[PDB]
Design an enzyme around this catalytic site. Structure first.
Site, PDB file in Angstrom:
ATOM      1  N   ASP A 129       0.980  -0.931   0.280  1.00 42.98           N
ATOM      2  CA  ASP A 129      -0.011   0.373  -0.382  1.00 42.98           C
ATOM      3  C   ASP A 129       1.179   1.059  -0.228  1.00 42.98           C
ATOM      4  OD1 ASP A 129      -1.277   2.049   2.118  1.00 42.98           O
ATOM      5  OD2 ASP A 129      -2.894   1.262   1.844  1.00 42.98           O
ATOM      6  N   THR A 151      -3.626   5.574  -3.976  1.00 47.26           N
ATOM      7  CA  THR A 151      -2.625   6.270  -4.317  1.00 47.26           C
ATOM      8  C   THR A 151      -1.407   5.972  -4.714  1.00 47.26           C
ATOM      9  OG1 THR A 151      -1.715   5.000  -1.840  1.00 47.26           O
ATOM     10  CG2 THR A 151      -3.848   6.323  -1.674  1.00 47.26           C
ATOM     11  N   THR A 152      -0.734   5.264  -5.143  1.00 46.84           N
ATOM     12  CA  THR A 152       0.181   5.095  -5.811  1.00 46.84           C
ATOM     13  C   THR A 152       0.430   6.011  -7.299  1.00 46.84           C
ATOM     14  OG1 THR A 152      -0.212   3.357  -5.339  1.00 46.84           O
ATOM     15  CG2 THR A 152       1.988   3.334  -6.018  1.00 46.84           C
ATOM     16  N   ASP A 200      -9.915  -1.274   0.531  1.00 43.17           N
ATOM     17  CA  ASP A 200      -9.774  -0.146  -0.606  1.00 43.17           C
ATOM     18  C   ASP A 200     -11.332  -0.350  -1.470  1.00 43.17           C
ATOM     19  OD1 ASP A 200      -6.722   0.482  -0.778  1.00 43.17           O
ATOM     20  OD2 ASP A 200      -6.133  -1.008  -0.974  1.00 43.17           O
TER      21      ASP A 200
HETATM   22  N1  LIG Z   1      -5.510  -7.470 -15.033  1.00 42.43           N
HETATM   23  C1  LIG Z   1      -4.592  -6.306 -15.045  1.00 42.43           C
HETATM   24  N2  LIG Z   1      -4.621  -6.037 -15.821  1.00 42.43           N
HETATM   25  C2  LIG Z   1      -3.848  -5.291 -16.576  1.00 42.43           C
HETATM   26  N3  LIG Z   1      -3.481  -3.600 -15.374  1.00 42.43           N
HETATM   27  C3  LIG Z   1      -4.824  -4.093 -13.871  1.00 42.43           C
HETATM   28  C4  LIG Z   1      -5.251  -5.029 -14.150  1.00 42.43           C
HETATM   29  N4  LIG Z   1      -5.861  -4.917 -12.799  1.00 42.43           N
HETATM   30  C5  LIG Z   1      -5.540  -4.070 -12.383  1.00 42.43           C
HETATM   31  N5  LIG Z   1      -4.652  -3.320 -13.075  1.00 42.43           N
HETATM   32  C6  LIG Z   1      -4.209  -1.937 -13.322  1.00 42.43           C
HETATM   33  O1  LIG Z   1      -3.114  -1.872 -12.110  1.00 42.43           O
HETATM   34  C7  LIG Z   1      -3.543  -0.609 -11.701  1.00 42.43           C
HETATM   35  C8  LIG Z   1      -3.588  -0.636  -9.634  1.00 42.43           C
HETATM   36  O2  LIG Z   1      -2.156  -0.439  -9.424  1.00 42.43           O
HETATM   37  P1  LIG Z   1      -2.143   0.087  -7.922  1.00 42.43           P
HETATM   38  O3  LIG Z   1      -1.033  -1.040  -6.779  1.00 42.43           O
HETATM   39  O4  LIG Z   1      -3.888  -0.511  -7.038  1.00 42.43           O
HETATM   40  O5  LIG Z   1      -2.415   1.425  -7.892  1.00 42.43           O
HETATM   41  P2  LIG Z   1      -3.264   2.633  -6.802  1.00 42.43           P
HETATM   42  O6  LIG Z   1      -2.634   2.141  -4.999  1.00 42.43           O
HETATM   43  O7  LIG Z   1      -2.753   4.039  -7.203  1.00 42.43           O
HETATM   44  O8  LIG Z   1      -4.490   2.198  -7.307  1.00 42.43           O
HETATM   45  C9  LIG Z   1      -4.841   0.149 -11.882  1.00 42.43           C
HETATM   46  O9  LIG Z   1      -4.338   1.116 -12.850  1.00 42.43           O
HETATM   47  C10 LIG Z   1      -5.449  -0.809 -12.781  1.00 42.43           C
HETATM   48  O10 LIG Z   1      -5.747   0.018 -13.939  1.00 42.43           O
HETATM   49 MG   LIG Z   2      -4.511   0.966  -5.512  1.00 37.19          MG
END
Ligand SMILES: Nc1ncnc2c1ncn2[C@@H]1O[C@H](COP(=O)(O)OP(=O)(O)O)[C@@H](O)[C@H]1O
Ligand SMILES: [Mg+2]
Ligand SMILES: Nc1ncnc2c1ncn2[C@@H]1O[C@H](COP(=O)(O)OP(=O)(O)O)[C@@H](O)[C@H]1O
Ligand SMILES: Nc1ncnc2c1ncn2[C@@H]1O[C@H](COP(=O)(O)OP(=O)(O)O)[C@@H](O)[C@H]1O
Ligand SMILES: [K+]
Ligand SMILES: [K+]
Ligand SMILES: [K+]
Ligand SMILES: [Mg+2]
Ligand SMILES: [Mg+2]
Lengths: 513, 513, 513
Positions: C51, C84-85, C377
């Site tokens: 996170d 948040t990332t 989340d």
């Molecule tokens: N199956 C998938 N293939 C590609 N990208 C994905 C998939 N599932 C989720 N994502 C991407 O992962 C990102 C979320 O990463 P995350 O670690 O949650 O960052 P944040 O904490 O900023 O939301 C989103 O931009 C989403 O589009």
């Molecule tokens: Mg996220």
């Protein structure tokens, strides 16, 4: 102050301020009403003077730019001899004027290119506002010498020192019309008062005669100078005499005695009756010399040998077998004397002296260590006048003329170098300003009258009289200087200010040289 | 540098330099193209702003004269509200101009007596070159507010903030036509974007209702305000009840219960349905209040009590026996809400609000801590225009006019104060100079065109456009300021520069006060 | 490195680099193939998570600008809950893109005015490229929840957690259609496996019943909640009973016993059979409660009182004399149980629950401290979809669309802000770039195919599949996000980058606040 203020000025402000400090140090020494500085050592030695380059040379100075301003004085010392305070004051005023344009955000290269155009114009102007005089004219030489001595504490004797120095310098003007300063010997013997200083048409030698049977007074001397020692020669191949017959002890010894006897016979046959040796004379040689009535000194230093050869017309001889009547000098009087507690040999009434000695007297060593400076400066300015034959008006009447004639210049120039040309022209009036500041006069009221005298006449000459407190013709007053003192000053100061204007960083070096 | 340079400047040079440093610190924050400073603590707190008086207030500053220049900003903060950078820059330029005359040896008292004659003339000129506008004219108020917000990073919302602030200030103009700044409440709740800022015709209170059975939304509220606590009274003479019959335990306790029951009955009989208490409410009182359906908050702070009384028209009551329908305020809507993570009570649609609340929104605390400043400055300039009804042209078009009209003055004055009058008139052009310096424009070429526009017209208005890089009418452009910003600035700066000019010594004090 | 390199970069380079460091720290946590960080204390405590805002919150961070970037995460945490990332990575890419224009000597204000024009355009574009869905549509809510849980190590249970969270959130949607996060209680009891997590339509209380004779299981409970303590009242006026007849010792004591007996009689007459007290119950009161067969807990915390009142429909009562059948809540089952080693009271089968409890299970405390984050989340993104009813395509298919549509924008803009608009549009592709970087794919070859899919269609949706390593429709794939996650992210990042672009100095502060 505080730590958190190091940020608030550029490197150029740093350097300009570090420079202004040096010019502020020496400025109060300027002009007839100038005052002296006291210099004190770590070890307790003391110097008292108002000579500028001496203050700048003996000071503990640590910032690089201030170190760069000291070189402005030394060059005036070396190439001219007088003027080492005008140069530094003008340099610092140029720094401080430049500071007034950088706080309006004018580019440094623009300032430098303006100063450059102004200094060449000041050279033209100085070459055309000067007065042309012949080198045989001893009167104006006297007046210039007196002008050099004024303001130095040794003023009370200037009307005698002037005559002494004029003759002293006129003697050493060489067959090509040039003055060499080292052909005049300056000697500093205490006792009596400053008015007992005198000029010797000859030499004073730091020696006493080897054998006391030797006559202490000689008239119409025949002087012989030797670079070889009067001693028994050695073989540069190594030797042993090997005495196999006892009867040959005294014989070897007698032959060494004869090898000195013959040298003294030969010195006599040349016609000599006074001797100088740059090297040793043996104690038996001394005997034969005192037996023949020849006066001798030994281990005489090389510079004294040069000055003797110059004064008498003798030739320094390296081997006694060639010594002849052709090699002997002549001098009307030689005598050993005791003066100021030291035994010294005096040579006088020389046949045609190409070198002369000046004997400075005084009641105290700190007095004589200043009178020597006050005489060196006059030898300088007299040589300048004799070599160039061009003079300029004193009392700051030249700087006002230059400022005006550069302002008439600045209207022809267009762009932003005009600003720097004006700041240059307005920086030369620091000299007549300070000349009033030191005398306790009102500078702002004086300077306007001084300018007005010029603007209505083309009067090259009018300037401040710091005694009556009034504006007078400085040529009728007899305050005259040689042209080479101005040109060199401005030239040095401009060239040294441009370097500090062209720098923008300061970084550290790894054992540079 | 080096130790042996402490000698080389006077105490006045010391003070003038220590002062110039402060003005050099804040100068790059000036004008629309100004830039921000970052302030860092010993403990790690951080502030980002270009507000001048804030920089000068939070800086570690240790030299006395720099401490004396900070007081030039605070007075502009206190008496006007905007203009705290013009004052300090003009002050330091006056210091630095004065430095240019002391190196020509002008007496300090002469400088001070000249500056004095110049500043009164600048007061006359400022009182006659201004434009006269009525206080009801909301359009020019908007234009002035926008002019106050320009250059502060929060520019993107200025055309909304202007309307908000104009209404907010117009509300609190009192029955005598004067603006009090503390009658506007500024609140700083994060989340959303700067464009989500809004104006409340009422109050936001940092409280939640005491008992959750209490209705969370009320319309056409009848609001009662108390300074007394709803609690069982004590005797200020000390008491004991002494229970000799067991049957009198519950009776004493029931009578204390009734002494709260009757207070709640009385609050109801006034007609109230919303309550605020500046002090405690007991947990049984809370019961009867939630049983009667009256909404109550407790321990409300005094300033919030003032703002509630102002907004609703309620009267703060100190004793419940006097509370009547005469004492109750009115408000169209009251509701508790959760915003930005905090529970808060909102009062809205007030009957005749003499106080208003501005709710500043933003994505970050460092953003809101700056938007608050950008709004405080606009409240300042709007109050100034509403109170005085006089405006002046912006973009430095005023300083050029003043410099010209003081130079036309300086030819009437004779003596040496004329020099100081000219240096004063030439020091006000630091503002249009810096306005070009920050935008990366060529200041020396700009300033001449700006002057020319005035000299041919009597054009009060012409000045620099820092975007097109051209000289324009600053009234047609809508860049307007209130007259009180100039007069106060010049007045402060002159009075604070004269003190540093009149000092000549610095000595140490023995626990002064 | 070395001391003598501090000179070689500006304050803006300082700040931009200090900022880039933070974004470089968290970047490898992004996307489904993201990896976790280990955080270690001074004292030896340990945290394992990916996170982002947690990493940025627990890190030892000392430079001011890095401290300013942490506030970009917290606002996304507070206002949205997920994302948040993306915010911090986009912020640092904006910093680093800005660095590429300042080394071409573009003025900072020009960059800031360009970024400003780009972000409003990105708001327009995001408001028009989104898909509109109804809040009753539980299927897409499930899909969004699963998308929130992907990449977090707790992937193995996502297809159960999704159903749990969707029901949990759908329960607490209030009568005005808004989701409050604190109405869902998250509890973390170890033992069993992550797939043994379950949802309670009621409350779990950290309490055990006061007296063990009290029935441990109750069906169709009648629950009474009290804020007053069941204890003998005191007089707030001070008392002494004074016993003058010996026969009146037991009488006083019996009457205190009766004053508790009557309270219990009254609690019974309301109809209750389960009790909660936010405060003390006396040990004799406990006796009468266990004699009447009423189940009681004491000193219950206020938040648990709120959640009980919400779940059962009971009213918290402050005085027992008013307690009636109107104030009692209802719940189908109440029982005390022992779970994970703790005794707890369970409330189940509630009549109309306005609050719900989620019970997270797990084999280790470090496991549950992460599953809680992975559920928080999803509660976030589900609330966002329920409140706004607008969704956007995932897998970085949005950033490519925005970059293209801002480049089509940038040709309309002229001047030098066009450069900053292009650098802004080219900085949003950091997200699909990193999404390929983490999976070990070839980003430069992937990004072109992704762009091409858009340029030929107006396909809003096409993006990277990080498993097959191919470009696919991300709506047919079911990778969906709520619109509020993008707008807030870009809004925060732009507003926080402009502050570091507007600063040019760093100075020290004197105990700021
Ligand atoms: N199956 C998938 N293939 C590609 N990208 C994905 C998939 N599932 C989720 N994502 C991407 O992962 C990102 C979320 O990463 P995350 O670690 O949650 O960052 P944040 O904490 O900023 O939301 C989103 O931009 C989403 O589009
Ligand atoms: Mg996220
Ligand atoms: N009678 C005089 N009145 C005014 N100025 C004079 C007079 N005599 C000499 N001066 C000036 O004094 C200056 C010489 O000062 P000095 O201390 O020698 O400085 P520097 O060492 O640089 O030559 C010259 O500029 C000269 O014009
Ligand atoms: N559009 C504009 N063009 C030029 N100057 C402007 C413009 N708008 C405002 N200004 C000038 O900016 C100055 C205000 O700068 P500011 O940072 O507020 O300083 P202070 O804090 O001292 O008021 C004023 O002198 C005003 O004339
Ligand atoms: K002198
Ligand atoms: K500003
Ligand atoms: K992740
Ligand atoms: Mg001299
Ligand atoms: Mg201002």
């Amino acid at each position: 102050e505080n730590m958190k203020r190091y940020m608030g000025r550029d490197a150029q402000r740093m350097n300009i301020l570090a420079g202004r400090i040096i010019a502020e140090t020496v400025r109060s020494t300027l002009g007839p009403k100038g005052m002296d500085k006291m210099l004190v050592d770590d070890l307790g030695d003391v110097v008292v003077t108002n000579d500028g380059v001496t203050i700048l040379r003996e000071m503990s100075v640590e910032h690089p730019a201030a170190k760069m301003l000291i070189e402005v004085a030394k060059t005036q010392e070396k190439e001219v001899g007088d003027g080492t305070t005008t140069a530094v004051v003008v340099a610092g005023e140029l720094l401080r004027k430049a500071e007034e344009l950088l706080d309006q955000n004018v580019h440094p290269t623009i300032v430098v290119k303006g100063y450059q155009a102004a200094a060449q114009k000041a050279q033209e102007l100085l070459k055309t506002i000067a007065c042309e005089v012949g080198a045989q004219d001893k009167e104006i030489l006297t007046k210039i010498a007196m002008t050099s001595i004024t303001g130095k504490g040794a003023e009370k004797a200037k009307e005698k020192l002037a005559e002494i120095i004029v003759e002293a310098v006129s003697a050493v003007v060489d067959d090509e019309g040039k003055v060499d300063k080292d052909l005049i010997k300056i000697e500093k013997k205490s006792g009596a008062s400053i008015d007992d200083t005198e000029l010797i048409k000859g030499v004073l030698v730091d020696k006493e005669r080897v054998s006391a049977q030797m006559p202490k007074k000689v008239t119409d001397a025949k002087i012989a100078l030797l670079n070889c020692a009067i001693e028994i020669k050695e073989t540069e191949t190594d030797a042993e005499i090997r005495i196999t017959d006892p009867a040959k002890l005294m014989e070897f010894i007698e032959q060494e005695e004869k090898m000195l006897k013959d040298m003294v016979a030969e010195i006599k046959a040349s016609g000599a009756n006074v001797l100088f040796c740059q090297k040793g004379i043996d104690d038996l040689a001394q005997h034969y010399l005192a037996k023949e009535g020849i006066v001798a000194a030994r281990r005489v230093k090389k510079s004294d040998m040069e000055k003797l050869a110059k004064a008498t017309g003798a030739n320094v001889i390296t081997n006694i077998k060639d010594l002849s009547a052709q090699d002997l000098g002549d001098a009307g009087l030689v005598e050993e004397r005791k003066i100021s507690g030291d035994s010294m040999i005096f040579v006088e009434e020389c046949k045609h002296p190409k070198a002369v000695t000046m004997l400075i007297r005084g009641t105290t060593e700190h007095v004589i260590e200043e009178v020597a400076r006050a005489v060196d400066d006059a030898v300088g300015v007299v040589g300048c006048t004799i070599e160039d034959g061009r003079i300029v008006s004193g009392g700051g009447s030249t700087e006002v003329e230059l400022s005006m004639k550069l302002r008439e210049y600045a209207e022809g120039i267009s762009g932003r170098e005009q600003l720097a040309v004006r700041a240059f022209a307005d920086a030369l009036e620091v000299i007549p300003r300070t000349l009033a500041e030191n005398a306790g006069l009102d500078a702002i009221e004086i300077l306007v009258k001084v300018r007005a005298a010029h603007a209505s006449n083309g009067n090259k000459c009018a300037g401040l009289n710091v005694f009556t407190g009034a504006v007078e013709d400085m040529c009728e007053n007899g305050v005259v200087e040689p042209l080479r003192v101005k040109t060199q000053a401005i030239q040095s100061a401009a060239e040294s200010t441009e370097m500090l204007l062209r720098i923008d960083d300061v970084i550290a070096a790894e054992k540079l040289r």
